[PDB]
Amino acid sequence: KDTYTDRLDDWNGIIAGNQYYDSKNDQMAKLNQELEGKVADSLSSISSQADRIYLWEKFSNYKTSANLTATYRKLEEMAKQVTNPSSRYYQDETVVRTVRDSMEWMHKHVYNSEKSIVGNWWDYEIGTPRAINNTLSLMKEYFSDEEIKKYTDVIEKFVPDPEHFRKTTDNPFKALGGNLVDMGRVKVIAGLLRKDDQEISSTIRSIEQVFKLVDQGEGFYQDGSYIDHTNVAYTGAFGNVLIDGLSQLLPVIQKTKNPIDKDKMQTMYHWIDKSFAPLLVNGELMDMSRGRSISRANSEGHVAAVEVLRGIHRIADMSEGETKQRLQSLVKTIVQSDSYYDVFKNLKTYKDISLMQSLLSDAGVASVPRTSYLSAFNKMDKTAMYNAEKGFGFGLSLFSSRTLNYEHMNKENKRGWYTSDGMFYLYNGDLSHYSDGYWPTVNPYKMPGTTETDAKRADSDTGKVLPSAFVGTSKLDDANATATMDFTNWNQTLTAHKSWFMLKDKIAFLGSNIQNTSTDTAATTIDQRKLESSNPYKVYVNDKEASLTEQEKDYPETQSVFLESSDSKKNIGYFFFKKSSISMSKALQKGAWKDINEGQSDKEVENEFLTISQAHKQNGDSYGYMLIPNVDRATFNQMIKELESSLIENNETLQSVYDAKQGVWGIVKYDDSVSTISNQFQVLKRGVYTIRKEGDEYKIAYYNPETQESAPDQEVFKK
């Protein structure tokens, strides 16, 4: 037809990619097989009675917005197969008619301009409109330009403003980040379908705002943080949608009369390198950045990671030169480092499958293991650490007066209460740790690293910001950093000065000033590790094999605990600076995804967990231990002997551990008193420090969590 159909043709190549299909292509044929079965199920179950209440019974309750999107997504699947020469439904008269028909019926009795949002606005302005655009785009050769307009009319009624969503409501909000991108997949495509030029130009102009880094509110920050939903760390869910959708759109947008300036898009590489890259470990997308998505059974870390990777790859393909090359190497090495998840299980279009296949087999693209790195995402209170030498990742999940602890929205993530209360993540040889039903089987009252009372929590509860702004990380280099959280629990009955000292190949956990004014007992979960029936651990307490049971066994006078696997890369050792009183247990924990997410399956799931905790029976209590992963038993025993004097201090005003091997100090000062460290120097300001002694010199890394600022050396360091 015209230039719009041209772009609409490019879109089809991106969202389905029938033109690249190849039956002799294993991965492609697998996805085709999947779509064939989908429309087969849809067709064999659609209602074909004279006068019907619903198109599909499973999605009849049209009061539930979700049923509109699910119903239309089914027609998009039919539209994909009907235009695929290799599909059994290719140009099928029945399939063509049911799509056209279904569009009309849905339009007649369910979704039209004369209707109003009922349920989630999201489906009315994003979910459904996208499915409609895609369906009309794929089958434009079967619809009249007039019918197309007719069917996208309702989209214009609900989403008239490319800059605001929920415009038909009493409180529309400005589209930013992920939402802004979907606004493009809604109005740019719909604009294309309607041959509406003003719509295209204004939506693109509106989309261009996503390329702006922010220093407040929602968006990407200079330090790599990405905030969404007012104050929630969301690089891993909304960031996904952002990069995923934008990467699909850009190729199309760029071929219009309103291409986005190159210098304007250059910021995308900032997101990739500073925001996304650090959150990817062995093909897994750190859960601490995925908000409520963690409660979705079909979006575990490795799966969520491919959403980002496919977006990054599309961007690399859109680039050229070293940029294309480096991005390709980035995607290639990450995917190849994933021995647990098959990346193709989440490449849902032929072009995406194709791109990935050529990348993996192109010998010209280097795939070299990622180097060590430490990202201090202070603008979202998270820290990601990775050691390339020992091969383990570490995630520190916190929150402050600037951020919400956990998101429970739309009945999702009902029990994430403590996932940001100083929760830590360890990524080692067991790539499936946080997968295979970890979230619905993990005991939510004992999130690893967290200090909490055992009071009962309500599923109906929702997030809160922390009273204190004294939460933050001061990074010295790629292997060393220190963090602290002026912790107070959800009902202000317990406090604790929790601090972490990341020192290259280990992390020390220090807690002091632990107080409890309530009646419930207080304890810190040193860990709750999910086990693999295939790789059993040999537990040692004080280097003596211990036999754990579902019943908590107490181990007083503990100097160390060691979990031994046949794979050094799965070993976890804990050295207690001062002999401590801990309790351990290994028990089968059962649950269902529905428990933490109403819309998930109620199917029972179960996993075996090893729980280690330390009770706090008095005020002024404390804890102190070093987490040492990926070393064998003899090396762990020898190391804890060397660290016998690493703890420099752990009280209510000062906390610090020292790495003699590196000549690095980790320090946290809660007050402005003069602290003399190791009889060598003085730290003078309240805040977080990471210092390295280089012979006669001292490299200083100071951070003031409250003002979110560093400071001149002479202000905080002396001698």
Ligand SMILES: CC(=O)N[C@@H]1[C@@H](O[C@@H]2O[C@H](C(=O)O)[C@@H](O[C@@H]3O[C@H](CO)[C@@H](O)[C@H](O[C@@H]4O[C@H](C(=O)O)[C@@H](O)[C@H](O)[C@H]4O)[C@H]3NC(C)=O)[C@H](O)[C@H]2O)[C@H](O)[C@@H](CO)O[C@H]1O
């Ligand atoms: C209660 C209310 O209306 N609160 C508003 C808040 O509304 C919420 O906005 C979200 C949003 O996207 O901004 C909505 O989140 C999305 O809901 C979808 C339907 O349940 C769900 O499918 C989305 O999940 C993603 O879907 C993608 C897709 O289907 O294409 C997937 O490709 C993607 O992998 C998957 O994660 C879900 N989005 C995310 C990122 O999880 C939420 O339902 C809706 O209630 C407004 O946004 C804010 C404005 O800042 O104000 C509140 O008051």
